[PDB]
Amino acid sequence: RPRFSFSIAAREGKARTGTIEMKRGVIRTPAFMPVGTAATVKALKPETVRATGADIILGNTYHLMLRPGAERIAKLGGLHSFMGWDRPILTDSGGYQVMSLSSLTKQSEEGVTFKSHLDGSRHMLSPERSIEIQHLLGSDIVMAFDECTPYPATPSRAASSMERSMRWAKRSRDAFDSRKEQAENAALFGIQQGSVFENLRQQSADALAEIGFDGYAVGGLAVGEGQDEMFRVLDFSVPMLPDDKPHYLMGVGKPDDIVGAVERGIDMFECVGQAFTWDGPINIRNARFSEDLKPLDSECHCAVCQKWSRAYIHHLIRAGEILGAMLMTEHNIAFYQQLMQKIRDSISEGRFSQFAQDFRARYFA
Amino acid sequence: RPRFSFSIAAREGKARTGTIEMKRGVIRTPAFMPVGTAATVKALKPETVRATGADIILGNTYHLMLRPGAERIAKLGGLHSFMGWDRPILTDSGGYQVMSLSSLTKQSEEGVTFKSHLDGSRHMLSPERSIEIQHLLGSDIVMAFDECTPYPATPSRAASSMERSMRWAKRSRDAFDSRKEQAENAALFGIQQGSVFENLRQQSADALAEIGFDGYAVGGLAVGEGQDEMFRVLDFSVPMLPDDKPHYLMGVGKPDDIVGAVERGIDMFECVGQAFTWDGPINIRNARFSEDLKPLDSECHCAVCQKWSRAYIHHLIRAGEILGAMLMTEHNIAFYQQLMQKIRDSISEGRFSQFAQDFRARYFA
Ligand SMILES: NCc1c[nH]c2nc(N)[nH]c(=O)c12
Ligand SMILES: NCc1c[nH]c2nc(N)[nH]c(=O)c12
Ligand SMILES: [Zn+2]
Ligand SMILES: [Zn+2]
């Protein structure tokens, strides 16, 4: 029932477990957020997303502002009613996908203009318009509009981009705050930049803390630097952020990356023929599964593993059948939610370090 | 609980309503059978197919004998356990799709040899092998292997093909009967041929009745002759079949075709951006639905119409999202099951002629 309340129930090292309370529901942390692109978590009904244990989903902004359009979604009642998900939704700012999926983008201090990847339509995106679009969609957790930094990045370019990002973070803060219904009902997260440079991460964290946000993302990672480098940067970056607010690592979702990131103080993650299993991923298209009657994973509690075999799913995926996508997706998102649950429980019980060890021994065996 | 028992509970004119009792369940007639191709009713879990009200599904034989293979399905426990549908399955003989989807087919009195449409693999299909494959899949209702007749067809060619079909019907009968487990647990339907020729339909019906089957299909229609011609042929063809056994019209599923066919004594049908509504079909991709908050149909009891709007489904289909296929398919199969229910109830209440009238007035308004 409050607009936003993050409470930490238990800790182990840098790891934390707790809850974020919002108007539309409670979010258990560490949290994994399935991703909705074009107002759908691909191949799943929202009731099925919920059934896997998800407390919140991410809505990509870029595709919705192109199709079906933010204004139209607002006229139709907002994203939650449009897609039939009534729990929190975190929306991205749209900047990532502009720069990664759009064309003829022209960047400047005001923002970015671009042509979409689908048509030739002209479009504009600034801190102000991004916050507006997230409002029109009815987002619960709004992300500040930033300027991401390619990897690798020179210190000068990483600095310029981080600085611009902090200027846009203030503009984001003010746009959000000047819209009463959004300010009163949603939350706003700021994004830390700085590439792999500690001094720049520090300056960014300081700037963001000065402005003040409900949560802080670590942006700029998982863009080519490798897990070792990513963890090294997290080692010094996450402590710079306010302890008492949630920490979201953008673009990170491999099971092992999630475990090590939680070990480094991260609280929120998203979804980035592969099936996850506690013994490591499998590619279900491999011929070795064509007569395998076992479920995708031997322990998994999901409906898919209760009800269908590897052999059947192998057949469906090789045949390009939609049910194959449906089943593979339900299992994988369930597997991630079970990972998060095991993480939450082990932290609450002060045995997370052990969990991490055990998980890795078997997942890479 | 018996292998096969068809009981007629009520009649109106040539229309009948009742039940087929089989080991795996009861089938309400007139029945609409969703089609499973490659061991899946496209984009639906079997629990969802059931939820729409389906009592039985059709399994296409052709694709399964190519992928995943009949022998493999039998090793894995049969089609019902492979795909997770535990109720009756009617399997087609595979002949239709050979001739329509395969290559280098060489026909003869023994059967057909062909190369599949996917690979270059060589294959053979006779009455005996078709019955064997249906057994390997664990079919509850087995279709005799026939030689369908192109439309239009000359009387000589229609006669030759019908005669061959009756010879193969006997071979089908004997193959089925000589396999104890199949004979004791499954049912066998024969197929009437003869194109649009009354004398040939009569000879075929006689031949099939002499051999004896658990049910009789009307084959050879819905292959280009138009609804008027189709109904004209049904007018004289269906009475030639045994009254006390079910009558299956192959390849017929338009809602109006179903109503008129039931009016002519047919008991079983199958599935052949279009959404069915009681006011006629709509194409949900039309721009007129982009901000339409109404459900696909205003009366439909399905989960889709409870939970999502035209506008949302329009968006999903235009975006090529899998959930769009999922939702459109669940609604359409539910709509057909509701049509069948209204048909069964109106016959039981002696008001089917009125239902038919009313249905057509509004569906074509
Ligand atoms: N590189 C991490 C990442 C993934 N998606 C993101 N989107 C934005 N706007 N910024 C970011 O840093 C990220
Ligand atoms: N033309 C009706 C039809 C559809 N599918 C069928 N399959 C076979 N084997 N014979 C048939 O007559 C039909
Ligand atoms: Zn599973
Ligand atoms: Zn419906």
PDB file of N, CA, C and O in Angstrom, chain A residues 37-40 42-47 67-68 72 76 82-84 290-291 293 307-308 311-312 315-316 321-323 325-327 330, chain B residues 37-40 42-47 67-68 72 76 82-84 290-291 293 307-308 311-312 315-316 321-323 325-327 330:
ATOM      1  N   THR A  37       8.148  -7.362 -24.162  1.00  0.00           N
ATOM      2  CA  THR A  37       8.453  -6.523 -25.317  1.00  0.00           C
ATOM      3  C   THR A  37       7.132  -6.351 -26.095  1.00  0.00           C
ATOM      4  O   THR A  37       6.415  -7.354 -26.266  1.00  0.00           O
ATOM      5  N   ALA A  38       6.810  -5.171 -26.561  1.00  0.00           N
ATOM      6  CA  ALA A  38       5.541  -4.986 -27.273  1.00  0.00           C
ATOM      7  C   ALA A  38       4.359  -5.476 -26.451  1.00  0.00           C
ATOM      8  O   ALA A  38       3.444  -6.090 -26.981  1.00  0.00           O
ATOM      9  N   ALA A  39       4.394  -5.205 -25.150  1.00  0.00           N
ATOM     10  CA  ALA A  39       3.312  -5.439 -24.214  1.00  0.00           C
ATOM     11  C   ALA A  39       2.933  -6.909 -24.086  1.00  0.00           C
ATOM     12  O   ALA A  39       1.756  -7.206 -23.862  1.00  0.00           O
ATOM     13  N   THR A  40       3.920  -7.777 -24.174  1.00  0.00           N
ATOM     14  CA  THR A  40       3.745  -9.207 -23.924  1.00  0.00           C
ATOM     15  C   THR A  40       5.067  -9.831 -23.501  1.00  0.00           C
ATOM     16  O   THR A  40       6.133  -9.550 -24.078  1.00  0.00           O
ATOM     17  N   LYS A  42       6.996 -12.773 -24.048  1.00  0.00           N
ATOM     18  CA  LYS A  42       6.767 -13.593 -25.232  1.00  0.00           C
ATOM     19  C   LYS A  42       6.318 -15.010 -24.937  1.00  0.00           C
ATOM     20  O   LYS A  42       6.859 -15.774 -24.152  1.00  0.00           O
ATOM     21  N   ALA A  43       5.211 -15.438 -25.533  1.00  0.00           N
ATOM     22  CA  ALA A  43       4.607 -16.755 -25.518  1.00  0.00           C
ATOM     23  C   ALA A  43       3.966 -17.124 -24.174  1.00  0.00           C
ATOM     24  O   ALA A  43       3.620 -18.290 -23.967  1.00  0.00           O
ATOM     25  N   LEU A  44       3.802 -16.166 -23.264  1.00  0.00           N
ATOM     26  CA  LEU A  44       3.119 -16.467 -22.020  1.00  0.00           C
ATOM     27  C   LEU A  44       1.974 -15.478 -21.743  1.00  0.00           C
ATOM     28  O   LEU A  44       2.160 -14.270 -21.891  1.00  0.00           O
ATOM     29  N   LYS A  45       0.867 -16.007 -21.261  1.00  0.00           N
ATOM     30  CA  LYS A  45      -0.205 -15.200 -20.672  1.00  0.00           C
ATOM     31  C   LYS A  45       0.310 -14.640 -19.363  1.00  0.00           C
ATOM     32  O   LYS A  45       1.125 -15.308 -18.693  1.00  0.00           O
ATOM     33  N   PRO A  46      -0.128 -13.456 -18.968  1.00  0.00           N
ATOM     34  CA  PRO A  46       0.277 -12.896 -17.691  1.00  0.00           C
ATOM     35  C   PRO A  46      -0.024 -13.826 -16.520  1.00  0.00           C
ATOM     36  O   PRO A  46       0.793 -13.842 -15.600  1.00  0.00           O
ATOM     37  N   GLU A  47      -1.119 -14.587 -16.538  1.00  0.00           N
ATOM     38  CA  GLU A  47      -1.354 -15.496 -15.400  1.00  0.00           C
ATOM     39  C   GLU A  47      -0.258 -16.551 -15.231  1.00  0.00           C
ATOM     40  O   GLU A  47       0.150 -17.007 -14.145  1.00  0.00           O
ATOM     41  N   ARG A  67       5.039   0.893 -31.419  1.00  0.00           N
ATOM     42  CA  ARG A  67       3.800   0.126 -31.576  1.00  0.00           C
ATOM     43  C   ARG A  67       3.419  -0.549 -30.272  1.00  0.00           C
ATOM     44  O   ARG A  67       4.221  -1.344 -29.737  1.00  0.00           O
ATOM     45  N   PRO A  68       2.240  -0.232 -29.747  1.00  0.00           N
ATOM     46  CA  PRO A  68       1.180   0.538 -30.375  1.00  0.00           C
ATOM     47  C   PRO A  68       1.165   2.059 -30.247  1.00  0.00           C
ATOM     48  O   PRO A  68       0.235   2.629 -30.837  1.00  0.00           O
ATOM     49  N   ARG A  72      -1.736   6.033 -27.359  1.00  0.00           N
ATOM     50  CA  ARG A  72      -2.846   5.087 -27.563  1.00  0.00           C
ATOM     51  C   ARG A  72      -3.043   4.175 -26.374  1.00  0.00           C
ATOM     52  O   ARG A  72      -4.114   3.850 -25.888  1.00  0.00           O
ATOM     53  N   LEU A  76      -6.371   3.757 -23.966  1.00  0.00           N
ATOM     54  CA  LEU A  76      -6.967   2.456 -23.705  1.00  0.00           C
ATOM     55  C   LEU A  76      -6.861   1.999 -22.264  1.00  0.00           C
ATOM     56  O   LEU A  76      -7.303   0.889 -21.958  1.00  0.00           O
ATOM     57  N   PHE A  82      -4.115  -2.989 -20.598  1.00  0.00           N
ATOM     58  CA  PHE A  82      -3.971  -3.432 -21.987  1.00  0.00           C
ATOM     59  C   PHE A  82      -3.499  -4.875 -22.076  1.00  0.00           C
ATOM     60  O   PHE A  82      -4.064  -5.700 -22.798  1.00  0.00           O
ATOM     61  N   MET A  83      -2.448  -5.229 -21.348  1.00  0.00           N
ATOM     62  CA  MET A  83      -1.843  -6.555 -21.432  1.00  0.00           C
ATOM     63  C   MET A  83      -2.358  -7.511 -20.378  1.00  0.00           C
ATOM     64  O   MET A  83      -2.070  -8.703 -20.479  1.00  0.00           O
ATOM     65  N   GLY A  84      -3.107  -7.065 -19.388  1.00  0.00           N
ATOM     66  CA  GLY A  84      -3.663  -7.928 -18.352  1.00  0.00           C
ATOM     67  C   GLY A  84      -2.679  -8.341 -17.279  1.00  0.00           C
ATOM     68  O   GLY A  84      -2.796  -9.461 -16.783  1.00  0.00           O
ATOM     69  N   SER A 290      16.056 -36.767 -28.272  1.00  0.00           N
ATOM     70  CA  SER A 290      14.886 -37.131 -29.064  1.00  0.00           C
ATOM     71  C   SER A 290      14.092 -38.261 -28.417  1.00  0.00           C
ATOM     72  O   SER A 290      12.909 -38.338 -28.747  1.00  0.00           O
ATOM     73  N   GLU A 291      14.650 -39.104 -27.555  1.00  0.00           N
ATOM     74  CA  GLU A 291      13.844 -40.157 -26.907  1.00  0.00           C
ATOM     75  C   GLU A 291      13.991 -40.123 -25.389  1.00  0.00           C
ATOM     76  O   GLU A 291      13.779 -41.104 -24.658  1.00  0.00           O
ATOM     77  N   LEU A 293      12.791 -39.302 -21.941  1.00  0.00           N
ATOM     78  CA  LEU A 293      11.492 -39.108 -21.313  1.00  0.00           C
ATOM     79  C   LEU A 293      11.528 -38.267 -20.051  1.00  0.00           C
ATOM     80  O   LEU A 293      10.474 -37.926 -19.479  1.00  0.00           O
ATOM     81  N   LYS A 307       4.616 -32.146 -16.572  1.00  0.00           N
ATOM     82  CA  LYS A 307       3.678 -32.637 -17.580  1.00  0.00           C
ATOM     83  C   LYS A 307       4.266 -33.085 -18.909  1.00  0.00           C
ATOM     84  O   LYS A 307       3.583 -33.893 -19.556  1.00  0.00           O
ATOM     85  N   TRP A 308       5.433 -32.643 -19.349  1.00  0.00           N
ATOM     86  CA  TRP A 308       5.967 -33.027 -20.646  1.00  0.00           C
ATOM     87  C   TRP A 308       7.437 -33.436 -20.588  1.00  0.00           C
ATOM     88  O   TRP A 308       8.149 -32.995 -19.693  1.00  0.00           O
ATOM     89  N   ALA A 311      11.748 -35.256 -24.768  1.00  0.00           N
ATOM     90  CA  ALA A 311      11.554 -35.757 -26.123  1.00  0.00           C
ATOM     91  C   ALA A 311      10.484 -34.964 -26.871  1.00  0.00           C
ATOM     92  O   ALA A 311      10.568 -34.643 -28.061  1.00  0.00           O
ATOM     93  N   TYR A 312       9.398 -34.663 -26.151  1.00  0.00           N
ATOM     94  CA  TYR A 312       8.285 -33.951 -26.751  1.00  0.00           C
ATOM     95  C   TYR A 312       8.710 -32.521 -27.072  1.00  0.00           C
ATOM     96  O   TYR A 312       8.413 -31.980 -28.141  1.00  0.00           O
ATOM     97  N   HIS A 315      10.953 -32.329 -30.027  1.00  0.00           N
ATOM     98  CA  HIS A 315      10.134 -32.461 -31.223  1.00  0.00           C
ATOM     99  C   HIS A 315       9.478 -31.136 -31.592  1.00  0.00           C
ATOM    100  O   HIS A 315       9.583 -30.673 -32.726  1.00  0.00           O
ATOM    101  N   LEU A 316       8.848 -30.488 -30.610  1.00  0.00           N
ATOM    102  CA  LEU A 316       8.171 -29.220 -30.858  1.00  0.00           C
ATOM    103  C   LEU A 316       9.130 -28.148 -31.360  1.00  0.00           C
ATOM    104  O   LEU A 316       8.817 -27.419 -32.312  1.00  0.00           O
ATOM    105  N   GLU A 321       7.107 -25.449 -33.735  1.00  0.00           N
ATOM    106  CA  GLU A 321       5.779 -25.305 -33.177  1.00  0.00           C
ATOM    107  C   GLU A 321       5.738 -24.283 -32.054  1.00  0.00           C
ATOM    108  O   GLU A 321       6.570 -24.170 -31.155  1.00  0.00           O
ATOM    109  N   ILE A 322       4.670 -23.470 -32.094  1.00  0.00           N
ATOM    110  CA  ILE A 322       4.515 -22.455 -31.052  1.00  0.00           C
ATOM    111  C   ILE A 322       4.492 -23.040 -29.658  1.00  0.00           C
ATOM    112  O   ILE A 322       5.042 -22.449 -28.735  1.00  0.00           O
ATOM    113  N   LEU A 323       3.855 -24.193 -29.429  1.00  0.00           N
ATOM    114  CA  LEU A 323       3.850 -24.748 -28.085  1.00  0.00           C
ATOM    115  C   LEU A 323       5.272 -24.995 -27.595  1.00  0.00           C
ATOM    116  O   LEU A 323       5.536 -25.000 -26.408  1.00  0.00           O
ATOM    117  N   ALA A 325       7.810 -23.045 -27.974  1.00  0.00           N
ATOM    118  CA  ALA A 325       8.247 -21.775 -27.404  1.00  0.00           C
ATOM    119  C   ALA A 325       7.548 -21.520 -26.079  1.00  0.00           C
ATOM    120  O   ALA A 325       8.154 -21.087 -25.106  1.00  0.00           O
ATOM    121  N   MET A 326       6.269 -21.801 -26.068  1.00  0.00           N
ATOM    122  CA  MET A 326       5.469 -21.623 -24.858  1.00  0.00           C
ATOM    123  C   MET A 326       6.073 -22.423 -23.712  1.00  0.00           C
ATOM    124  O   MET A 326       6.260 -21.929 -22.588  1.00  0.00           O
ATOM    125  N   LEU A 327       6.323 -23.710 -23.984  1.00  0.00           N
ATOM    126  CA  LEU A 327       6.813 -24.562 -22.880  1.00  0.00           C
ATOM    127  C   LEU A 327       8.219 -24.205 -22.462  1.00  0.00           C
ATOM    128  O   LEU A 327       8.565 -24.160 -21.259  1.00  0.00           O
ATOM    129  N   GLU A 330       8.095 -20.976 -20.350  1.00  0.00           N
ATOM    130  CA  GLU A 330       7.526 -21.112 -19.018  1.00  0.00           C
ATOM    131  C   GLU A 330       8.558 -21.792 -18.119  1.00  0.00           C
ATOM    132  O   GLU A 330       8.804 -21.320 -16.999  1.00  0.00           O
TER     133      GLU A 330
ATOM    134  N   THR B  37      -1.630 -31.061 -35.394  1.00  0.00           N
ATOM    135  CA  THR B  37      -0.665 -31.379 -36.442  1.00  0.00           C
ATOM    136  C   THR B  37       0.703 -31.531 -35.748  1.00  0.00           C
ATOM    137  O   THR B  37       1.023 -30.692 -34.886  1.00  0.00           O
ATOM    138  N   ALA B  38       1.490 -32.521 -36.089  1.00  0.00           N
ATOM    139  CA  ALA B  38       2.780 -32.697 -35.413  1.00  0.00           C
ATOM    140  C   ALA B  38       2.619 -32.758 -33.903  1.00  0.00           C
ATOM    141  O   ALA B  38       3.416 -32.193 -33.167  1.00  0.00           O
ATOM    142  N   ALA B  39       1.574 -33.444 -33.449  1.00  0.00           N
ATOM    143  CA  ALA B  39       1.315 -33.760 -32.058  1.00  0.00           C
ATOM    144  C   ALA B  39       1.119 -32.527 -31.186  1.00  0.00           C
ATOM    145  O   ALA B  39       1.490 -32.561 -30.009  1.00  0.00           O
ATOM    146  N   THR B  40       0.506 -31.505 -31.748  1.00  0.00           N
ATOM    147  CA  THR B  40       0.109 -30.309 -31.005  1.00  0.00           C
ATOM    148  C   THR B  40      -1.054 -29.620 -31.703  1.00  0.00           C
ATOM    149  O   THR B  40      -1.077 -29.474 -32.938  1.00  0.00           O
ATOM    150  N   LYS B  42      -2.185 -26.350 -32.543  1.00  0.00           N
ATOM    151  CA  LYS B  42      -1.243 -25.238 -32.597  1.00  0.00           C
ATOM    152  C   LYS B  42      -1.531 -24.124 -31.610  1.00  0.00           C
ATOM    153  O   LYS B  42      -2.615 -23.583 -31.453  1.00  0.00           O
ATOM    154  N   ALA B  43      -0.543 -23.744 -30.809  1.00  0.00           N
ATOM    155  CA  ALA B  43      -0.498 -22.657 -29.852  1.00  0.00           C
ATOM    156  C   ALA B  43      -1.352 -22.901 -28.601  1.00  0.00           C
ATOM    157  O   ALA B  43      -1.571 -21.968 -27.825  1.00  0.00           O
ATOM    158  N   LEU B  44      -1.833 -24.125 -28.389  1.00  0.00           N
ATOM    159  CA  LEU B  44      -2.567 -24.406 -27.171  1.00  0.00           C
ATOM    160  C   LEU B  44      -2.006 -25.634 -26.435  1.00  0.00           C
ATOM    161  O   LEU B  44      -1.744 -26.658 -27.066  1.00  0.00           O
ATOM    162  N   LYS B  45      -1.932 -25.530 -25.124  1.00  0.00           N
ATOM    163  CA  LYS B  45      -1.703 -26.682 -24.249  1.00  0.00           C
ATOM    164  C   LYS B  45      -2.948 -27.543 -24.289  1.00  0.00           C
ATOM    165  O   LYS B  45      -4.061 -26.996 -24.442  1.00  0.00           O
ATOM    166  N   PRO B  46      -2.815 -28.852 -24.155  1.00  0.00           N
ATOM    167  CA  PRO B  46      -3.976 -29.722 -24.117  1.00  0.00           C
ATOM    168  C   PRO B  46      -4.973 -29.325 -23.033  1.00  0.00           C
ATOM    169  O   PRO B  46      -6.167 -29.463 -23.300  1.00  0.00           O
ATOM    170  N   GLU B  47      -4.537 -28.834 -21.873  1.00  0.00           N
ATOM    171  CA  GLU B  47      -5.536 -28.432 -20.866  1.00  0.00           C
ATOM    172  C   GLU B  47      -6.456 -27.305 -21.341  1.00  0.00           C
ATOM    173  O   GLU B  47      -7.660 -27.175 -21.045  1.00  0.00           O
ATOM    174  N   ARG B  67       7.637 -36.788 -38.831  1.00  0.00           N
ATOM    175  CA  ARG B  67       8.263 -36.273 -37.611  1.00  0.00           C
ATOM    176  C   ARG B  67       7.247 -36.171 -36.489  1.00  0.00           C
ATOM    177  O   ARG B  67       6.228 -35.465 -36.647  1.00  0.00           O
ATOM    178  N   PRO B  68       7.489 -36.872 -35.385  1.00  0.00           N
ATOM    179  CA  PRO B  68       8.715 -37.574 -35.046  1.00  0.00           C
ATOM    180  C   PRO B  68       8.915 -39.020 -35.495  1.00  0.00           C
ATOM    181  O   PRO B  68      10.002 -39.524 -35.178  1.00  0.00           O
ATOM    182  N   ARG B  72       8.813 -44.227 -33.166  1.00  0.00           N
ATOM    183  CA  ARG B  72       9.376 -43.505 -32.013  1.00  0.00           C
ATOM    184  C   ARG B  72       8.313 -43.110 -31.013  1.00  0.00           C
ATOM    185  O   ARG B  72       8.405 -43.188 -29.799  1.00  0.00           O
ATOM    186  N   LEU B  76       7.970 -44.199 -27.045  1.00  0.00           N
ATOM    187  CA  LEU B  76       7.810 -43.209 -25.992  1.00  0.00           C
ATOM    188  C   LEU B  76       6.468 -43.259 -25.288  1.00  0.00           C
ATOM    189  O   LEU B  76       6.227 -42.430 -24.408  1.00  0.00           O
ATOM    190  N   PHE B  82       2.673 -38.702 -25.132  1.00  0.00           N
ATOM    191  CA  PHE B  82       3.664 -37.793 -25.714  1.00  0.00           C
ATOM    192  C   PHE B  82       3.208 -36.343 -25.653  1.00  0.00           C
ATOM    193  O   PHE B  82       3.941 -35.449 -25.221  1.00  0.00           O
ATOM    194  N   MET B  83       1.985 -36.060 -26.083  1.00  0.00           N
ATOM    195  CA  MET B  83       1.480 -34.694 -26.170  1.00  0.00           C
ATOM    196  C   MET B  83       0.686 -34.275 -24.952  1.00  0.00           C
ATOM    197  O   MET B  83       0.386 -33.088 -24.829  1.00  0.00           O
ATOM    198  N   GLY B  84       0.343 -35.169 -24.045  1.00  0.00           N
ATOM    199  CA  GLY B  84      -0.396 -34.838 -22.832  1.00  0.00           C
ATOM    200  C   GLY B  84      -1.882 -34.630 -23.034  1.00  0.00           C
ATOM    201  O   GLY B  84      -2.452 -33.793 -22.336  1.00  0.00           O
ATOM    202  N   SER B 290      -8.117  -1.073 -33.751  1.00  0.00           N
ATOM    203  CA  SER B 290      -6.919  -0.698 -33.006  1.00  0.00           C
ATOM    204  C   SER B 290      -7.264  -0.035 -31.676  1.00  0.00           C
ATOM    205  O   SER B 290      -6.388  -0.084 -30.814  1.00  0.00           O
ATOM    206  N   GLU B 291      -8.437   0.556 -31.472  1.00  0.00           N
ATOM    207  CA  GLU B 291      -8.759   1.146 -30.158  1.00  0.00           C
ATOM    208  C   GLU B 291     -10.090   0.626 -29.621  1.00  0.00           C
ATOM    209  O   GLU B 291     -10.778   1.237 -28.788  1.00  0.00           O
ATOM    210  N   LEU B 293     -12.164  -1.540 -27.382  1.00  0.00           N
ATOM    211  CA  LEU B 293     -11.968  -2.187 -26.093  1.00  0.00           C
ATOM    212  C   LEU B 293     -12.870  -3.383 -25.852  1.00  0.00           C
ATOM    213  O   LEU B 293     -12.727  -4.099 -24.841  1.00  0.00           O
ATOM    214  N   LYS B 307     -10.948 -11.553 -20.664  1.00  0.00           N
ATOM    215  CA  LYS B 307      -9.718 -10.941 -20.164  1.00  0.00           C
ATOM    216  C   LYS B 307      -9.010  -9.962 -21.086  1.00  0.00           C
ATOM    217  O   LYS B 307      -8.275  -9.132 -20.529  1.00  0.00           O
ATOM    218  N   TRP B 308      -9.167  -9.989 -22.400  1.00  0.00           N
ATOM    219  CA  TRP B 308      -8.444  -9.090 -23.285  1.00  0.00           C
ATOM    220  C   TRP B 308      -9.340  -8.444 -24.340  1.00  0.00           C
ATOM    221  O   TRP B 308     -10.368  -9.015 -24.686  1.00  0.00           O
ATOM    222  N   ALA B 311      -8.479  -4.501 -29.144  1.00  0.00           N
ATOM    223  CA  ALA B 311      -7.351  -3.616 -29.410  1.00  0.00           C
ATOM    224  C   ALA B 311      -6.016  -4.301 -29.122  1.00  0.00           C
ATOM    225  O   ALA B 311      -5.009  -4.174 -29.827  1.00  0.00           O
ATOM    226  N   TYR B 312      -5.988  -5.036 -28.007  1.00  0.00           N
ATOM    227  CA  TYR B 312      -4.769  -5.705 -27.590  1.00  0.00           C
ATOM    228  C   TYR B 312      -4.444  -6.827 -28.572  1.00  0.00           C
ATOM    229  O   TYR B 312      -3.295  -7.018 -28.981  1.00  0.00           O
ATOM    230  N   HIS B 315      -3.125  -5.556 -31.804  1.00  0.00           N
ATOM    231  CA  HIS B 315      -1.730  -5.188 -31.607  1.00  0.00           C
ATOM    232  C   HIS B 315      -0.821  -6.409 -31.677  1.00  0.00           C
ATOM    233  O   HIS B 315       0.155  -6.428 -32.422  1.00  0.00           O
ATOM    234  N   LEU B 316      -1.181  -7.463 -30.941  1.00  0.00           N
ATOM    235  CA  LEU B 316      -0.373  -8.677 -30.921  1.00  0.00           C
ATOM    236  C   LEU B 316      -0.247  -9.303 -32.304  1.00  0.00           C
ATOM    237  O   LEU B 316       0.850  -9.711 -32.713  1.00  0.00           O
ATOM    238  N   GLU B 321       3.311 -11.373 -32.593  1.00  0.00           N
ATOM    239  CA  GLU B 321       3.569 -11.956 -31.294  1.00  0.00           C
ATOM    240  C   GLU B 321       2.859 -13.287 -31.112  1.00  0.00           C
ATOM    241  O   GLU B 321       1.701 -13.534 -31.444  1.00  0.00           O
ATOM    242  N   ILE B 322       3.609 -14.230 -30.520  1.00  0.00           N
ATOM    243  CA  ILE B 322       3.024 -15.549 -30.277  1.00  0.00           C
ATOM    244  C   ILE B 322       1.765 -15.490 -29.443  1.00  0.00           C
ATOM    245  O   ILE B 322       0.828 -16.241 -29.693  1.00  0.00           O
ATOM    246  N   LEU B 323       1.681 -14.633 -28.421  1.00  0.00           N
ATOM    247  CA  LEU B 323       0.459 -14.582 -27.634  1.00  0.00           C
ATOM    248  C   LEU B 323      -0.738 -14.243 -28.514  1.00  0.00           C
ATOM    249  O   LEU B 323      -1.862 -14.591 -28.207  1.00  0.00           O
ATOM    250  N   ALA B 325      -1.366 -15.408 -31.451  1.00  0.00           N
ATOM    251  CA  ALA B 325      -1.818 -16.685 -31.996  1.00  0.00           C
ATOM    252  C   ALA B 325      -2.503 -17.508 -30.918  1.00  0.00           C
ATOM    253  O   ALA B 325      -3.542 -18.119 -31.138  1.00  0.00           O
ATOM    254  N   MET B 326      -1.899 -17.504 -29.755  1.00  0.00           N
ATOM    255  CA  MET B 326      -2.451 -18.237 -28.617  1.00  0.00           C
ATOM    256  C   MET B 326      -3.875 -17.773 -28.340  1.00  0.00           C
ATOM    257  O   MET B 326      -4.808 -18.574 -28.167  1.00  0.00           O
ATOM    258  N   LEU B 327      -4.031 -16.449 -28.229  1.00  0.00           N
ATOM    259  CA  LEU B 327      -5.371 -15.945 -27.858  1.00  0.00           C
ATOM    260  C   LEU B 327      -6.382 -16.140 -28.962  1.00  0.00           C
ATOM    261  O   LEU B 327      -7.552 -16.523 -28.734  1.00  0.00           O
ATOM    262  N   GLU B 330      -7.437 -19.853 -29.028  1.00  0.00           N
ATOM    263  CA  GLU B 330      -8.272 -20.294 -27.920  1.00  0.00           C
ATOM    264  C   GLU B 330      -9.690 -19.772 -28.148  1.00  0.00           C
ATOM    265  O   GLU B 330     -10.656 -20.539 -28.018  1.00  0.00           O
TER     266      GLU B 330
END
